[PDB]
Every structure is written in structure tokens, then in C-alpha cells.
Design a binder for this molecule. Structure first.
Ligand code: HEM
Ligand code: HEM
Ligand SMILES: Fc1cccc([C@@H]2C[C@H]2CNCCc2ccnc(-n3ccnc3)n2)c1
Ligand SMILES: Fc1cccc([C@@H]2C[C@H]2CNCCc2ccnc(-n3ccnc3)n2)c1
Ligand SMILES: C[C@H](O)[C@H](O)[C@H]1CNc2nc(N)[nH]c(=O)c2N1
Ligand SMILES: C[C@H](O)[C@H](O)[C@H]1CNc2nc(N)[nH]c(=O)c2N1
Ligand SMILES: [Zn+2]
Lengths: 411, 407
């Protein structure tokens, strides 16, 4: 079964055969579409077929399907599985797996870069302190003095699910959020719960509007531990506007390295519960979501006041106007400090090309429209006009419950 | 099976049960989501008619009543003998209001029950069709105090006698391809403007020529009719700060009136059912003015603003887009023609969602369409999870007539 998708700005049509290789479930049925829903221990029983299917893709990509290298590895994995209940990936397989999980991330607009991923193998790690060291090296390599590089560090896979490695932070770099007695919130409101935990676990909080959270790291199912990233490793950018000289006085800054650290990486049935990864920011992530969401830094008003905008009627589009300048400022600041960043027009255009290239060479490109489309200026970016099929390939990056909700405290 | 939807900006959770009455299909499966695809007999008819009449008689608290049971038999009887059946005016209005209610792609559904329904089922000719449309236009415009309306022509019979309005909207601007290879006026209408000339329209070949109506009655050949200008309210677009803006030569019409959809009620098919509300600002400002496949004026406006169009990263497209939309809302409000901004509209829809969960157990909605084409995440519907499914009575798309019409 072939499936066609159409771009309504260019009339270009594309055919998807790739969706046939999709195993996992979407959350939709023929009677309901859940495409706007954010969120719609494993036995030898089902592991080898997962292992086989993965190793089969692997060997096709290296053009060795059916070869002796292929069959012996299939056999080797099998024996390791019924003997030891699990198995270990070669380095070559891990790398491949990581690249492809990225490649299959239908919510990521930056996948054009997917082949250029630096994979760090932390599968020999045993302690939190070990984890800290690995992470710092990640933050340094990926940061590269502002010329950012894509990277992922991969810690040991899950075993019985009682010895998980986890990074409790949702991102490696992120600002504290303090709930005040008067109900207001100092810093980033998203991180309030996580800030509290840190404080409880012994973190001494400066209590400012931009405090870099400590890392809270869990190795082998043990209680997590705190570590303070060397400040000299944390690239930050002061935010200023190129025309408005009062903008700098808003006292805003942001960090350069966007690094997701709470997802689960699945390769051939293997589950890697600690797999922090990092690219570079698309402007709107900071400019629109981080700064302007009502549940985040919410600087819309305070910015709009200083702009002297008609704030009396929403039909003056003061909000829309302010949003744009803030985003302009974010891009300006980063380029001025030579820290890698991409604007939403640039990124979306690249993605369309990437996506086209992927139908040609791969027969499809899973993509979540709800997420691919930028959160401002939607229809003047080409992805808005782009039909997109969403499905789930493996390897994959999956969500996983917050570890404070599951962890068994040793004490 | 009993679903919950979460707003991620307010933590409000609504439970959806209404979806369990969904009848038609979405085109999605368990393996593939198509939520961003634009378009995914007597034995057939009676069950259809029953489902409708049941929910109708339930809505009027006479479910199971004799009137209910009687009507069920009465309609059953007619289907058996005529192969079709006809709707009572009460049923016709309820069906219409409810088709709008179920329109998961329409952000303005909070107004759903204040729909004026015009029964035009006694229409026989295109000339008659013109008269009804003109009356609809005039009523809904209301000198600029817009009122929602639908005018409903006779239902399909054998598919040979279909009524159709060929225009996609009652009021649209023509589009002409130049020898220049460029496109003057509205590119979305190039092919329709063609057929208009092909049927005999004398195009003034301007940028903003109001298209004529091309009406088809009882399956006959369609006929051209020009809407009396004095019934077509237009707004000259000026910016409330840029005086150079007026020289851009921009204007838009006030009445947004979809005319190409198919209205399904209790199995019956109304292939001609023009309906109209009032514009959300971005419909014109973002989509009509700035889509690349449309009037595409962004460059010209940016040039006029003297913005560094050298790099995408100056967000100059973004900057202009805002001003242009300010202008549109400005012009309409200055001429006292009803218009709603994307902020008020989406806020209204959030409220409507909460009422619908509370009074009906849910609200089908298509996120890809409800989120406005600008400033997505600063409207509240962005952080609102929505479930999409198709309820009936319904507005469905249907093929353009020039591909179907037996000439
Ligand atoms: C290199 C430049 C990159 C850019 C510009 C980029 C862009 C984005 C953006 C804007 C999002 C939306 C995040 C949100 O709205 O919450 C996203 C999501 C995502 N990206 Fe990236 N990305 C990049 C690199 C990467 C890398 C290196 C990986 C993994 C190896 C990756 C995997 C993902 C995944 C798995 C998601 C979905 C996360 C979720 O569901 O919460 N991306 N990407
Ligand atoms: C009264 C104020 C109204 C507002 C503010 C409004 C708003 C909108 C908007 C913004 C769209 C998106 C259109 C697009 O981007 O192409 C839409 C579509 C739609 N509206 Fe409304 N509308 C209104 C009245 C009505 C009425 C009176 C009806 C029916 C009786 C209706 C039914 C629909 C339907 C069926 C669609 C989907 C059409 C399609 O799929 O192309 N709306 N509406
Ligand atoms: F399922 C959810 C329930 C609540 C909140 C949520 C927030 C959206 C998820 C965050 N998504 C990742 C955001 C992010 C931050 C920093 N860097 C990236 N990033 C880096 C490379 N690619 C993306 N992404 C999900
Ligand atoms: F699937 C498609 C293929 C080609 C064009 C397409 C355009 C989106 C459909 C138009 N949607 C209606 C636009 C419109 C215009 C004027 N008024 C309204 N309107 C009025 C009240 N509610 C909506 N809607 C879809
Ligand atoms: C409810 C809704 O699906 C949710 O807010 C989504 C919408 N699209 C998004 N798109 C991106 N890139 N990131 C997000 O967090 C979201 N949020
Ligand atoms: C590809 C995508 O489905 C298509 O561009 C949709 C996106 N959302 C839309 N939303 C509205 N309101 N109107 C539209 O025409 C569209 N087009
Ligand atoms: Zn779906």
C-alpha cells in the first residue's frame, strides 16, 4: 500500500511506502484522531524478534544482508539472549541505532543533520560521579566554544528495571524555578518541582532569575546525587535587541546548548533510560516558548510596556508585535556572540528539503505536523502547507515517567 | 474508551464521552496518523434517518414519546415508498445548527445555535437560486453588523438533479494569468475565473474584480449572475500608522461565505448550502494576503517598511505579517464591519470547548485547523489537546462541479 502526501503551496506530491515498516501504535483509530495529544523489565520471549528486526535493518544499510557476518551475529545474539536474558550491541550497532532514533523522531525539525551525530559510549559507566564526568565532557564537546556539535551520551541499558541509570534533570542545562510565599514565581516556572527536589537533596540555591540547576544523577538504580556543572562549561548569552537599547536592561540571558536528558532510547529491544542528547536551538524555542508562554518567563507584557504598545485591546496585536521583537533579539544576540542558532524560516525550509530527500531515498519520513510547525508565523513557513504522515519507527526516542514518581528510595 | 483532554497551560482536564457516538471514519489507523492530510439506497437511508430523528427527539426531551415514535414510522413509511424523504422545518434547522456544531475545523462554533436558516428547498431555477443568495448576502451583511446564515437548496435525488453553486465562496476576487507569466488578482481563482469567461463573463481584468455567481439548478447547465455591488460590502485596507499603506491598493470583502460544501442530515444530501459567518482577522491578513500561492504581498510590504530583507534571520517576514494583520483588523473596525482577532476567537473557542464538554460530553476539534496561522503558541488553543472525530449531521467536502457535470 502506497500513500501520497501533498504540499499545497508547491503542488509537489510524495509517496510513502516506509509506513509499512511501522510496528508501534499512534494512539489513533479509524474513529478518532489523537494527533494533538502530547502523550497517547522485558522478557526473552519478545526480545529476539526485536533484536532480529533491528540487526536486519543494520545489515541492509551496510549492504550485508544475508551475509555470513549477518547470520553469525544473528546467531550470536540469539545465544547470548537465552543464556543471559539480554544482549550487548557492538559499537557499530549502537552508533547506527542512535542516528536512526534521531532520524525517526517525527517531532524533530532538525533531522536534516541526522547523519552527523557524535555518539559517546558511556556503557562502561557505573557511578553517578562517573555519569557527571561523562556529561561534562558531553557539554564541553557539544558546546565547542559556541560552534555547536550534535552529540549523545549513552549510559548502560536497563536490566531488570531495578538498576536503571537516569538523569533526573529534563535538560542538562536549565534554570531554577522558585515558588514564592506570595504565589508568584522566581525564575523558570517549568522547573519549580525539579528545583524543589534539588534543594531538598541538599542543593544550596542562590535564588535568582537565572540559576543553572545542578545535575541530579542516578546510576545502577541507586539514589541520585547532585553535581554542579563547572560554570565555565555553561555557555550563556545575554539577550539584547539590535534597535531597542532598553532590551538589554530586561536582564535576560539564556544558555546555548539545548540538551534533552529525560528520554528513553530504544535500540533492538534494548532500553537506554539515560541517553542525554544535544543539538542547537531553533530561535522560537527560546523566543516564543521559553520567554513568552504564559506558564514560563512571560515577558510579553513587560516587553510590550517598554515598547509603548496599545495594550488596551488585543485587536491591536500588541502581543503578536512584542513576540516578534523578542524573537528578533534572541537571534541577534546569539549571532553576535557566535553561538550556533537557527531561525524558524531557515530550519523549516531545510526540513522540507530533508523530508523530500527522505521520500526519495527511504520511501518516507515520519513527521508530526503539530510539532514540526513553528509556534509563531506558522503559515509563512513552508511546513504549514506540507501534509505529513505520522508513524512510529524503531530505533526510537520515547517518553518515560519522571524518575521521582517511580524510584525506590534506598536511603 | 472514555478519553481525557488536557490543557497544558492551565492543567484543566476534560473527559470526552461524545466521541463514542462517532459514526464516520478519520482516515487514521493505529499505525498511521493522517491528522494533517487535507482530505482523508433505502436500506442505507432509514438507519441514517433514525439516528438523526432519535437525537433530534432527544434534544427536545420527547425521546421515546409518541410524537417521536410516530415520526419514526411516518419517515420509515415515506422511505419505503418514495425511496427518499423530506425534513420538517424544525428538523432542518436543528440539523443545520448541528452540522455547524460538529464542524471540527471551525473555530467560531461558540455561536453555533444562533444560525439563521433559509429554507430554499422550493427553488427550481438558477434565477431563483440567485434571488435566494442575494437575500442571504443582504441579510447576513446587515450593513456591516454580520449575522451567521445558511440557505439550503433542494436535496440531491438521483445525482442527476444536483443543485450546485460553482463558486467556492459567494464573494471572491477573480484571478488572471498574464502573458507576463505572472498572476494578476487572486491566484486561487485563476481556473474559476477561466470558466467564468468560458461561460461568457466579461472580465474587467483588475486586481480585485468581484467574481460573478455561477449557479446550477436541478442538474442543468450553470448560469452567470452578477451580485448587485451595493450588496457586496468591501473594506479599503489602511494601516493605523503607515500612511503609505493605502497606496498598496488593498481591499477585502466583508462577507465570508463558504458555498462549495455538502450538508448531510439524516442521510439526506444538500449539495448546495451556502453559509456565512464573519472573518477571523488572520483568514484575510495571513492566508489571503501573505500565502505564497495567493496575493503574496509580503515582499512589497517589507520593501515599503525598509526592512533588511537580506536574511531570513531578521524576521522581516514576521514583522510585516503582524503590521498587515493589524491593518486588517484596523480597517474593518474603522468601517464598523464585524471581524474578530485570533486572540479573542481562540479564547472564545476555549470557553466553547468547556461548555461543550460540560453540556454534551465533548467537542470534536481539529487542532491543525483551530490554531491560527500566526502567533500559534500565544493563543490559548495551542496548549489545548483536542480530539478529532466526525459527528453527523455534517458539512463534508465534495468534488468541484466542473469535473462532474454532465454537460
Ligand atoms: C541539531 C539541531 C536540532 C534542531 C534545530 C532540533 C530541533 C528540534 C525542535 C525545535 C524540537 C521541538 C522541541 C519542543 O518543542 O519541545 C525538537 C524535538 C526533538 N528533537 Fe531535535 N533538534 C536538533 C537536534 C536533535 C538531536 C541531536 C536529536 C537526538 C539525537 C534530536 C531529537 C529530537 C527528539 C527525540 C525531539 C522530540 C522531543 C520530545 O518529544 O519532547 N534533535 N527538535
Ligand atoms: C460566525 C463566526 C465564524 C467564525 C469566526 C468562523 C471561523 C472559521 C475559521 C477561521 C475557519 C478556518 C477556515 C480556513 O482556514 O479555511 C472556519 C472553517 C469552517 N467553518 Fe466557520 N466560522 C464562523 C461561522 C461559521 C458558520 C455559520 C458555519 C456553518 C453554519 C461554519 C462552519 C465552518 C466549516 C464547516 C469550516 C470548515 C470548512 C473547510 O473545511 O474548508 N462557520 N471557520
Ligand atoms: F510530553 C510532555 C509533557 C509535558 C511537557 C513536555 C515538554 C515538551 C517536552 C519538551 N520537549 C523537548 C524540549 C527541548 C529542550 C531542549 N532541547 C531540545 N532539543 C534538543 C535537540 N532537539 C530538541 N528540546 C512534554
Ligand atoms: F482541501 C482543500 C483544497 C483546496 C482548498 C481548500 C481550502 C481550505 C478550504 C477552504 N476553507 C474555507 C475557507 C473560508 C472562506 C470564507 N469563509 C469561511 N468561513 C466562513 C465561516 N466559516 C468559514 N471559510 C481546501
Ligand atoms: C496540546 C498540544 O498538542 C501541545 O501544546 C503541543 C502543540 N505543538 C507543539 N509543538 C512543539 N514543537 N512543542 C510543543 O511543546 C508543542 N505542544
Ligand atoms: C498541510 C496542512 O494540513 C494544511 O496546510 C492545513 C493546515 N491548517 C490549516 N488551517 C486552516 N484554518 N486552514 C487551512 O487551510 C489549513 N491548511
Ligand atoms: Zn490521527
Amino acid at each position: 500500500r502506497f500513500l501520497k502526501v501533498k504540499n499545497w503551496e508547491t503542488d509537489v506530491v510524495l509517496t510513502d511506502t516506509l509506513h509499512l515498516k511501522s510496528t508501534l501504535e499512534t494512539g489513533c483509530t479509524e474513529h478518532i484522531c489523537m494527533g494533538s495529544i502530547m502523550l497517547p523489565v522485558r522478557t526473552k520471549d519478545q526480545l529476539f524478534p526485536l533484536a532480529k528486526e533491528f540487526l536486519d535493518q543494520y545489515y541492509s544499510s551496510i549492504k550485508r544482508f544475508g551475509s555470513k557476518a549477518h547470520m553469525d551475529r544473528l546467531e550470536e545474539v540469539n545465544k547470548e539472549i537465552e543464556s543471559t536474558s539480554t544482549y550487548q550491541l557492538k559499537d557499530t550497532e549502537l552508533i547506527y541505532g542512535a542516528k536512526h532514533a534521531w532520524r525517526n523522531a517525527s517531532r524533530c525539525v532538525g533531522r536534516i543533520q541526522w547523519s552527523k551525530l557524535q555518539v559517546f559510549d558511556a556503557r562502561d559507566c557505573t557511578t553517578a560521579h562517573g555519569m557527571f564526568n561523562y556529561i561534562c565532557n558531553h557539554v564541553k564537546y557539544a558546546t565547542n566554544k559556541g560552534n555547536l556539535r550534535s552529540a549523545i551520551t549513552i549510559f548502560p541499558q536497563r536490566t531488570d528495571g531495578k538498576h536503571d541509570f537516569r538523569v533526573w534533570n529534563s535538560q542538562l542545562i536549565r534554570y531554577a524555578g522558585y515558588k514564592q510565599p506570595d504565589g508568584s514565581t522566581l525564575g523558570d516556572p517549568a522547573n519549580v518541582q525539579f528545583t524543589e527536589i534539588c534543594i531538598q537533596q541538599g542543593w544550596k540555591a542562590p535564588r535568582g532569575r537565572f540559576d543553572v540547576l545542578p545535575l541530579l544523577l542516578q546510576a545502577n538504580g541507586n539514589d541520585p546525587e547532585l553535581f554542579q556543572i563547572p560554570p565555565e562549561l555553561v555557555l550563556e548569552v545575554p539577550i539584547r535587541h539590535p534597535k531597542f537599547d532598553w532590551f538589554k536592561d530586561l536582564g535576560l540571558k539564556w544558555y546555548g546548548l539545548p540538551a534533552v536528558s529525560n528520554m528513553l532510547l530504544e535500540i533492538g529491544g534494548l532500553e537506554f533510560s539515560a541517553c542525554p542528547f544535544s543539538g542547537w536551538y531553533m530561535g522560537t524555542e527560546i523566543g516564543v516558548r521559553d520567554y513568552c508562554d504564559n506558564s514560563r518567563y512571560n515577558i510579553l507584557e513587560e516587553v510590550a510596556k517598554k515598547m509603548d504598545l496599545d495594550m488596551r485591546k488585543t485587536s491591536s496585536l500588541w502581543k503578536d508585535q512584542a513576540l516578534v521583537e523578542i524573537n528578533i533579539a534572541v537571534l541577534y544576540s546569539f549571532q553576535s556572540d557566535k553561538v550556533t542558532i537557527v531561525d524558524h524560516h531557515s530550519a523549516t525550509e531545510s526540513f522540507i528539503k530533508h523530508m523530500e530527500n527522505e521520500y526519495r531515498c527511504r520511501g518516507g519520513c515520519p513527521a508530526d505536523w503539530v510539532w514540526i510547525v513553528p509556534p509563531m508565523s506558522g503559515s509563512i513557513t513552508p511546513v504549514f502547507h506540507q501534509e505529513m504522515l505520522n508513524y512510529r519507527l524503531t530505533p526510537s526516542f520515547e517518553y518515560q515517567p519522571d524518575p521521582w514518581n517511580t524510584h525506590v528510595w534506598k536511603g
